[PDB]
Amino acid sequence: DVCPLTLGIETVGGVMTKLIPRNTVVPTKKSQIFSVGGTVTIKVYEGERPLTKDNHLLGTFDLTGIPPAPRGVPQIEVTFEIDVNGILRVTAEDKGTGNKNKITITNDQNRLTPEEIERMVNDAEKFAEEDKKLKERIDTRNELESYAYSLKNQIGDKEKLGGKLSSEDKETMEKAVEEKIEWLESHQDADIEDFKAKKKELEEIVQPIISKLYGSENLYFQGSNRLLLT
Numbered sequence: 116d117v118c119p120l121t122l123g124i125e126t127v128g129g130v131m132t133k134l135i136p137r138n139t140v141v142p143t144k145k146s147q148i149f150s151v152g153g154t155v156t157i158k159v160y161e162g163e164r165p166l167t168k169d170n171h172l173l174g175t176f177d178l179t180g181i182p183p184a185p186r187g188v189p190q191i192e193v194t195f196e197i198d199v200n201g202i203l204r205v206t207a208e209d210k211g212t213g214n215k216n217k218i219t220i221t222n223d224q225n226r227l228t229p230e231e232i233e234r235m236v237n238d239a240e241k242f243a244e245e246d247k248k249l250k251e252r253i254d255t256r257n258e259l260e261s262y263a264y265s266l267k268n269q270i271g272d273k274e275k276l277g278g279k280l281s282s283e284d285k286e287t288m289e290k291a292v293e294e295k296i297e298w299l300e301s302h303q304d305a306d307i308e309d310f311k312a313k314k315k316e317l318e319e320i321v322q323p324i325i326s327k328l329y330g331s332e333n334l335y336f337q338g339s340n341r342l343l344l345t
Contacts, residue, residue, distance in 0.1 A: 120235060122203065145195050155178035156177050161227070174205070187268050202220070295313055
């Protein structure tokens with residue numbers, strides 16, 4: 116037996132982040148870690164489309180008791196489990212406290228009929244060419260959004276990169292990510308080129324500063340790449 120639709124979770128911008136691909140053999144399991152910048156809401160979706168509005172909502176729950184922190188600071192592990200019965204269990208765990216809520220989604224009337232499923236598979240077959248470009252546009256935007264807050268959260272933690280950098284460079288880097296964040300706020304509908312170049316620009320700012328500190332040791336800074344849940 117195989118799962119009929121790709122299972123996923125909603126990420127920032129109404130984006131469908133896939134976890135369990137369609138035609139995956141049951142029983143299976145898959146985890147992925149996310150950053151959060153607001154209410155820790157986990158919206159479980161079902162479909163093959165890049166946006167969740169065009170997919171089928173299966174469930175929603177919030178992870179409660181996470182201490183207030185700036186955007187992207189808290190790290191959340193999300194685990195999708197399908198058993199051999201088609202029962203879907205979604206777990207969300209705060210990586211920093213062990214705080215853990217789990218939702219169980221059973222085969223009910225909200226389960227799609229094979230007619231409905233065929234329609235959904237066919238839909239993504241038709242808009243495939245347009246879904247690819249749209250998906251590869253939001254990816255680059257997210258890769259930008261990830262890098263900046265990952266950097267901003269690093270230079271704000273004294274127990275991390277923020278404890279190794281001088282005040283001047285720390286101020287320089289903080290003002291730089293602010294430029295890009297404020298840019299991303301007024302350019303959510305930008306091209307793949309603009310999102311690529313914007314990330315490249317931050318990297319060209321981080322590099323000379325990390326090189327001052329760890330160039331001799333051939334060390335470079337990496338972005339978490341983990342997606343924002345928001």
